[PDB]
Amino acid sequence: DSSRRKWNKTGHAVRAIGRLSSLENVYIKADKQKNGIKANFKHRHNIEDGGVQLAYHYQQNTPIGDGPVLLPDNHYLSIQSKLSKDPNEKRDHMVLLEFVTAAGITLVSKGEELFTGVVPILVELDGDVNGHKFSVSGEGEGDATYGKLTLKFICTTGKLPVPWPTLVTTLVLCFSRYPDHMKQHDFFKSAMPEGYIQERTIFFKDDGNYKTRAEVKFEGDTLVNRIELKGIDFKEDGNILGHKLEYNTRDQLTEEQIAEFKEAFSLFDKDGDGTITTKELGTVMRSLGQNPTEAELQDMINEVDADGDGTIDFPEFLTMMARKMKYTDSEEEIREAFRVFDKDGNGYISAAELRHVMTNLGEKLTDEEVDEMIREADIDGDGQVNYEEFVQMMTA
Ligand SMILES: [Ca+2]
Ligand SMILES: [Ca+2]
Ligand SMILES: [Ca+2]
Ligand SMILES: [Ca+2]
Ligand SMILES: [Ca+2]
């Protein structure tokens, strides 16, 4: 509870740099050739018994009508999803709560007027994955003022043959909250009421892919999303057809954990003003042996900068860190963190390697306290920290 403390804070600072170096959002760009947009993003699915299944999405949107649309400057959407079960529902089902917000641009079409209140939604999907066919129906509502969606889905053909989480992205970005300074970048609402075509290819790493085509348009008062999905090349006992994905990634976010995050926060926020600047982030990254440019520091901040002020405020930090504990890191990401300590790449963090990190981070730590830290993590007693020991110390 003091060697452990030194691991938690140092670990969380390396984790924060790993988040700030990653691309977790939905990246939107103009596609003038199709009078629409393109998007790309990496989605994480936690594997129930440990690890993560990545799903790489490519996306295109094209207007159904000929009316004028808004072609955006580059920006991203930040999406938080919560999946649950209706305790009264006997059918194979998913309850989905989503918040969708536009950001990434530092400090109103006629279609936007259709979204000022609560709008009912209907969703219909026909799928075929490796010849396993299915249908999904969904219903609920969207409130774009807040970016909020509540949807319940039923598998109307009986048993869903893929995990529910793998259909979330497929099963209405017209409900995004765009801030006042980004209204001209909201392609989705500008296409309404006639609507847009949304097409994706979704590559499940080390597995098969989904292809999707959807029509998103008003049908009277209701926003309808009608989809066809085709999956190919899935492995019979991979994560998808094997049902090895976690359903419900719980927001179980303790007070001990927030406090840990604040200790790592304050390692960056060295003037104690409650925000991290580019100068502050760069100081810590240099001390860890990295050498980012000003432009890279600005792009790292912009990835988690919800208010567009160019700094990571305390609450923006707590949000980014919560999400980093909710979804599992890839092997590549955990090795990268490991390498910050394992300087010589021999697979073992030595007392000398850890002393070097700790005293570069400005923590004054004796011979004796360094040994205490190794001892805290050193399961097999060899006096070093190997990869699997590092993983144990890093996990909650
Ligand atoms: Ca500061
Ligand atoms: Ca900010
Ligand atoms: Ca602020
Ligand atoms: Ca080493
Ligand atoms: Ca060891």
Residue numbers in the entry: 38 to 144, 159 to 222, 226 to 450
What do the study's own words say?
Here we constructed the prototype of a photo-switchable Ca2+ sensor based on GCaMP5G that can be switched with 405/488-nm light and describe its molecular mechanisms at the structural level, including the importance of the interaction of the core barrel structure of the fluorescent protein with the Ca2+ receptor moiety. We engineered a prototype rsGEI based on the conventional Ca2+ indicator GCaMP5G28 by coupling cis/trans photo-isomerization, which underlies the photo-switching, to Ca2+ binding. In the present work we introduce the concept of rsGEIs. These sensors show photo-switching only when bound to the molecule of interest.
We further mutated rsGCaMPs to increase brightness. The reason for the almost sixfold increase in brightness of rsGCaMP1.2 and rsGCaMP1.3 compared to rsGCaMP is apparent from their crystal structures, which show a I71H-enhanced water network and a direct effect of V107T in stabilization of the ON-state chromophore. This increase in ON-state stability alters the switching kinetics only slightly. For rsGCaMP1.2 we also elucidated the structure in the photo-switched state, which confirms the HT finding from rsGCaMP1.1. Overall this suggests that rsGCaMPs may be engineered using similar strategies as for RSFPs.
